[PDB]
Amino acid sequence: DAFVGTWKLVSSENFDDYMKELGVGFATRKMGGMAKPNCIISVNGDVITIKTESTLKNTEISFILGQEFDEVTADDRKVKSTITLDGGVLVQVQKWDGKSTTIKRKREDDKLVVECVMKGVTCTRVYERA
C-alpha cells in the first residue's frame, strides 16, 4: 500500500534513550545508535513482511494484521507482538514481562515516520524512499 517500498533511515531522535528505557545494553545500543537501516515493507495476500537491514544486524517479521505473533527483537527480547492498521497508521505493540512498547509507522508527505514509545520516552525516526 502506501507503506510498500524500500525505506532508508535519514533522521532519528531519542533512540538511545528509547533503547535504554527498554533495558538494552551498551553493545547493542552502540550498534543501534549510528545504524542507518533500510526498512523493506512488502505485502502478499494477508501477510505483511517488514525487513530491517543494516550492516551489523538484520531482522525480519511477517504477520497478519490483528494476529498476535512471537518475535525476537533486534535487542534479543522475546516478545508477543500485534500489529493493526488504525486510520492509516500501522500500530505495533510488543508485550513481554508485564511491559509493553508501541511502534507506530505512518506515511507523511515523502516520509515514513516511526514513533517508538517506552514509558515516558518517545523516539521519532524518519525514513525516505531509497
Ligand X SMILES: Cc1noc(-c2c(NC(=O)[C@H]3CCCC[C@H]3C(=O)O)sc3c2CCCC3)n1
Those residues whose C-beta lies under 8 Å from the C-beta of residue 111, and which sit 6 or more positions away, are 126, 127, 128
What is the smallest separation between the CB atom of 83 and ligand X, expressed in angstroms? 12
Cβ contact 56:45 at 8 Å: no
What is the smallest separation between the CB atom of 36 and ligand X, expressed in angstroms? 9
What is the smallest separation between the CB atom of 40 and ligand X, expressed in angstroms? 11
- Judge whether 126 is annotated as a binding position: yes
Provide the residue type at 11 as one letter: S
Cβ contact 53:70 at 8 Å: no
Interface with ligand X (CB under 6 A):
19, 22, 24, 28, 31-32, 35, 37, 39, 52, 54, 56-57, 73-75, 103, 114, 116, 125
Annotated binding residues, written as ranges, equal: 125-127
Annotated binding residues for a fatty acid, written as ranges, equal: 125-127
